[PDB]
Amino acid sequence: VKPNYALKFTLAGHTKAVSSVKFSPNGEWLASSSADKLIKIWGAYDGKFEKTISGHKLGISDVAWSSDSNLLVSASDDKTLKIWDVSSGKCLKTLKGHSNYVFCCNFNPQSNLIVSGSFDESVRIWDVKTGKCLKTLPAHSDPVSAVHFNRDGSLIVSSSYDGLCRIWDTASGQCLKTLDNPPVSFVKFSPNGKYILAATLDNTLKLWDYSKGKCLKTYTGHKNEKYCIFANFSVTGGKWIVSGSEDNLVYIWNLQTKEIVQKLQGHTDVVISTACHPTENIIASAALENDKTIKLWKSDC
């Protein structure tokens, strides 16, 4: 009915706000990115610090794992993305082309492509092996807050401060669908690729039927008017929605009933990022400048 997430570890080491935490697909690691220009790798089950990955010239807003857990991609204010070998920490490629801060990034399931979104209002699609920009999409009219592939890679969902969520055909880069118009600050596909979870800067999360173009669920009670906060589907136990919040809490909702089932207290600044572990009932949360830590929380369900 309800989870019982409790704090198990606090991970200190970034020296500015943490922007994004992500678990590796194989469950072994947590990657964190920060405004301190660094990526840090931590053991997912014990919080053990593994390594620092460095090379960006300005802060990082997002980090993402390849399907096989062997590569990372980071999005920076230095207008580049970087592809990293996680084992060696080496920068394999630098993706140049955006003309402003790169804010969000993701591999496709094949992990032959990276998608990125930027303050320059475009979405770019990149070749992992060569590092070349395959396609530039004039996707929005304000900064692009989030980009995500669906489970077979055939679609990209993007969101923007312009108020729009759009679905793009990966192969052709053409728009398939556009969904008050408050800024859309986060979006991602559900695991089954049937739904899209969208955050808007009016303190609201919404679950959309992609094909139907209709809103099925709305989740409220948290605070989100200012920052691009990540939101998640939690599927390892009970089916929850998880999000950070500008009141410094992690919120967990029952996906079906929309009821808040837990609020996790401990952070001392905006909880900008949360992530759900692929096999265990473990949440990672991270906060901005007044906090700068990552917390690992574990539940029985």
Binding site: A17, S61, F119, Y227
Partner: peptide, 7 residues
Amino acid sequence: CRKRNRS
């Protein structure tokens, strides 16, 4: 720039 409130 995800750490900043954009206005």
